[PDB]
Amino acid sequence: SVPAGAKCRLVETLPENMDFRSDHLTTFECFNEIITLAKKYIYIASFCCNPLSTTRGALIFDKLKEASEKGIKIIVLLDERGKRNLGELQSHCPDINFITVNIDKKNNVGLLLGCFWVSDDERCYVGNASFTGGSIHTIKTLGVYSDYPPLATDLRRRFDTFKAFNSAKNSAANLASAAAALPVSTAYHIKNPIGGVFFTDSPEHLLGYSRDLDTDVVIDKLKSAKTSIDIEHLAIVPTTRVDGNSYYWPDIYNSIIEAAINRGVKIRLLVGNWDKNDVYSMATARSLDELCVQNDLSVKVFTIQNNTKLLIVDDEYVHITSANFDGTHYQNHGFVSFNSIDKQLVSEAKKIFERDWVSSHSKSLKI
Amino acid sequence: SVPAGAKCRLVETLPENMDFRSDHLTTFECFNEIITLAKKYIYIASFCCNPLSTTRGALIFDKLKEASEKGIKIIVLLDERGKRNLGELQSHCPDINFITVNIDKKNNVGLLLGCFWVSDDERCYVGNASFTGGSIHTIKTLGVYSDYPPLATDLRRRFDTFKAFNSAKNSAANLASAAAALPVSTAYHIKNPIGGVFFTDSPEHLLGYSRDLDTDVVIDKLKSAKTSIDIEHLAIVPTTRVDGNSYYWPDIYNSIIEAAINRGVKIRLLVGNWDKNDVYSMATARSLDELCVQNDLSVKVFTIQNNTKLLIVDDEYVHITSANFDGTHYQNHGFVSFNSIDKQLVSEAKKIFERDWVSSHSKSLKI
Known part of the structure; x- marks a missing residue:
């Protein structure tokens, strides 16, 4: 029998200088557990890679360095635009294999976001905490950790796809014969979740023929909502x-x-702070502001560094990802989104949003 | 050979108390020509019917009354919600057949708009001038008149559909066996225009299997625009x-x-005046207002009584209708839209919009 929730537990970064508290596994604790238990490989994928920027981030890097020296295969995937730190990283860990990825050499718009760890086809982290000292220590993040091998293995298959776009000779990023020959596999979709959990993927030109486009899953859930929609993203503007x-x-x-x-759904949006240099965010805000007086819409803004990407629908579906709900991300960027319909896991996420909603760092939108 | 433009010419109502001038056929002149030349029938369809409200409207009614007395079959279709004047109309013209229509008895939302005249399968008017004294005399309207029998006949087929929804015993409005047995015919669509002219129709549940849904044609043209989009409607709000x-x-x-x-199209919107009782129009305005500073968008408002429904795309396509570009109309209401791709006819419409754009009755949107 498969365990309900696929042994998933929430993971977040709650910096000391912020009022967020919880009993969840911290990102620092999570990355420490993955390294400590690793026996075969550790695969990491995020846009940037800069662990040395904070104290906890550097400790994770040393643990990872010690693992690579003990025979563990360490592969870190970063987008070719996070390439500045590459020389610094290799000098600190000569035994870790760092690979720059370009998932879009036709138009040079698509970016690798990750954002996940996976090890030994048993344990994995997925969320919005990049392999940076900021995401590990000083920036609010949210993710999921599971030690369920069937789920972690399915996440490793996402790593196989991204690694194929290395910037080196014949690859899926430089040739079309080696890109169309890529088995873009997945074991679980929305049609067949594992213990109520499944991954969605992006962009569309990397789906293969079996993976679910995150765009369609997110929109279908938003259209099927009957009671509540809670979102904590960076921005919900229709223009990027x-x-x-x-x-x-x-x-x-x-x-x-x-x-x-149209359906009277109660909606709460916790988004980033609008700016005046881009007035077009104000009009989008004033459009959302006026819908709060008769429709059940509510908008609060935060100014803290916060990578949280959270969507909760009707207390039956939770969507944790690294991408932001906008056109640039959901049509070009390469990421994998955590989806779960486990009631207990959705409950824990609802508890997180309620906390963040009434945090001192969340102020009601005023224009 | 078929004549270019299908013998179509523009028709408009330019009230004396407004600064609009043109050499086009006036609505009053147009309705007088249709009656004077009629030898077999005159079919009229609009939402309301109230000719006696103005001087010119009453003159048209007397000409129509004189026609019905000379043996012409006169049928006037009005929506069952314009039923107040029905007793007054029948007492003035006992030989005209007035028929109330309900195109939506399942949900009682869809309304009959028309908005057209047709006679002898030879002449016809189509536009936004209802059979009311206001639309004939004191309210700005715009329409098209053609004496081309193939085009007028195709418009009469739209009248056959609407007449079937009379509020009397077994009909297409009261039974399903008599509604599914309705040949909803059309001779010309966008795939095969007649001299560059074709009709589109609405709503979708009255299309049959050959007619074009006006919603799809309008949106396709807006999406295919490469240079300019000029619109003169009552409102372009996404909420009704x-x-x-x-x-x-x-x-x-x-x-x-x-x-x-996305495409840098130059757009000019001439819409009705926003109101403060519905603040949600202000946010939609402020959203359109801010897109005018870097994008090629422009918005002017009018307060005059104006039924004009005009769309011009790239000086190659003109769309004159009686419906407004909103959800309530394009998903429920029954109307027929004039479409033409004749360069000369589109040119005359562009001349109309340029006039209206710089009229004293068109003020730039200020918030």
Whole structure:
């Protein structure tokens, strides 16, 4: 029999200078457990890699360094745009294999986000805490840890896809014959979760033929919501700026408003602070602000460094990811999203959002 | 050979107390020509019917009364909600057949708009001037008149569909066996225009299997725009209020903004004046207002009585209708939309919009 929730438990970074408290496994504790128990390999994938920026981050790096010296195969995937620290990392850990990834050499827009650890096809972390000293120590993050081998193995398959886009000679990033020959496998989708847990993936041109596009799963859940929608992301604006020109993409923005206006769903949005240099965020805010007076919409903003990407629907579905609900991410960026419908696990996530909602770092939107 | 533009010419109501001028056929002149030349029938369809409210409207009614007395079959279709004047109309013209229509007895939301005349399968008017004294004399309207029999005949087929929803015993509005047995025919669609002209229809549950849904044609044109989008409607808000609760529907609203932000299309919106009792129009305005500073979007408002429903795309496509670009209309209401890709006819419509844009009755949106 498979255990309910697939042995998943929440993981978060609660910095000392912030009022967030919990009894959950800290990110620092989590990464320490993965290294300590590792016997074969440790695979890590995040956009940036800069462990030496904080005290706890550097301790994780030394534990990882000690593991690589004891015979553990350590592979760290980072996007080619987090390449600055690469020389510093290799000089500190000459036995760890660092690989720069470019999942989009056709248009140079798609970025690798990860954001996960996996080891021995048994243990894994997935969430929004990059392999940086900030995400381990000083920045609020949220993730999930499971020591269930069937689930961790399915996460390792996501690592196989990303590693194929290394910037070296014939690869899935430089040739089309080696990219179309990539088995982009997955054992569990939304159609067949494992103990109520399943992964969704992105972007669409890396799905293969069996993986679920995170865009479709997220939107379907938002459209199927019957009572509540709680979201803690960085921004829920329908417009994002890729390099020079702006990009309009209201797919998620509409599914939220549609739930509030057409179906009377109670919605609480905990997003980043708006800025005046981009006035277009104010209009999007004033549009969301006015829907709070008769529709069951509510908006609070935070200014702290916070990587949390959390979605909870009707206390029956929880979505923890590393991407933000916007067009640039959900159409170009490469990430894997944690999904669970386990009642007990969703309950623990609802407890997290309630805490964050009434935190001193969450102020009601005023314009 | 078929004539380019299908012998279509623009028709508008330019009230004396407004600064609009043109050499086009006035609505009053148009309705007079249809009656004067009629030899077999005159079919009229609009939401309301109240010709006696103005001087010119009453003159049209007397001409129509004189026609019905000379043996012309006169049928006037009005929605069952414009039923107040029905007794007054029948007492003035006992030989005209007035028929109340209910195109939606399942949910009692869909309304008959028309909005057109057709006679002898030869001449027709289509536009936004209802059979009311206001639309004939004192309210700004815009429409098209053609004496091309193949085009007028295709418009009469739209009248056959609407007449079937009379509120009397077994009909397409009271039974399902008589509604599914309705040949909802059309001779010309967007796939095969006649001289560059074709009709689109609404709602979807009255399309049959050959007619084009106006919703899809309008959105496709807005998405295919490469240079300019000019619109003169009553409102382009993504939210409308049906009876008690509100209804969110941003399909057209998004296709316009997407054209401006993603494709740099120059857009000019001439819409009705926003109100403070519905603050949600202000937020939609402030969202459109801020997109005017870097994107090629522009918004002006009018307070005059104006039924004009005009869309022009890239000076290659013109869309004149009686419905407004919102969710309530394009998903429930029964109307027929004039579409033309004739360069000369689109040119005359562009001249109309340029006039209206710089009219004294069009003020730039300020919030």
